[PDB]
Amino acid sequence: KLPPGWEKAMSRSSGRVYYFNHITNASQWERPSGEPARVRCSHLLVKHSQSRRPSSWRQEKITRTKEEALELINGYIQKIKSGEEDFESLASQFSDCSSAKARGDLGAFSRGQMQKPFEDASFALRTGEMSGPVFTDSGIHIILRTE
Numbered sequence: 001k002l003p004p005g006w007e008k009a010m011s012r013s014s015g016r017v018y019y020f021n022h023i024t025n026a027s028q029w030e031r032p033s034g035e036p037a038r039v040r041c042s043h044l045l046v047k048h049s050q051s052r053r054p055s056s057w058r059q060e061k062i063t064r065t066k067e068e069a070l071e072l073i074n075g076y077i078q079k080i081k082s083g084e085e086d087f088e089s090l091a092s093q094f095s096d097c098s099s100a101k102a103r104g105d106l107g108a109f110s111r112g113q114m115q116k117p118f119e120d121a122s123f124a125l126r127t128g129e130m131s132g133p134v135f136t137d138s139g140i141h142i143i144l145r146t147e
């Protein structure tokens with residue numbers, strides 16, 4: 001059982017079973033629900049000093065470490081999941097991608113166009129679903145599949 005990409009896990013802190021997707025890095029308490037030619041995604045990118053281009057509209061020289069970037073991503077995911085903040089709001093303010101000006105929207109795309117870990121996570125997400133941290137040569141992404 002379980003849709004592909006998904007595995008059963010156990011919370012270290014509560015002992016309750018949860019589910020983890022090793023393609024999207026998503027995790028959820030509910031047993032998961034379950035390929036299109038194209039998907040539409042938004043994303044929030046946090047770059048780091050080893051990003052292919054360690055620069056963005058937010059910062060001419062991005063100096064943070066991969067670990068600092070993952071902490072920031074993790075914090076954004078927490079606030080999005082709690083509802084304290086909207087994905088679109090955090091992407092507009094803090095995404096190191098030029099798509100920040102479009103609330104993170106990348107428009108629609110096919111397989112073959114995006115960096116592979118991003119593509120795989122995008123196509124494995126269900127409509128409306130959000131990824132966990134997804135790593136590419138650009139940095140660390142939160143991906144929201146919108147279509």
Ligand SMILES: CC(=O)Nc1ccccc1F
Nearest residue numbers: 098099101102105106107
């Ligand atoms: C046009 C759009 O939808 N998104 C966008 C805007 C600026 C840079 C990159 C982008 F993906």
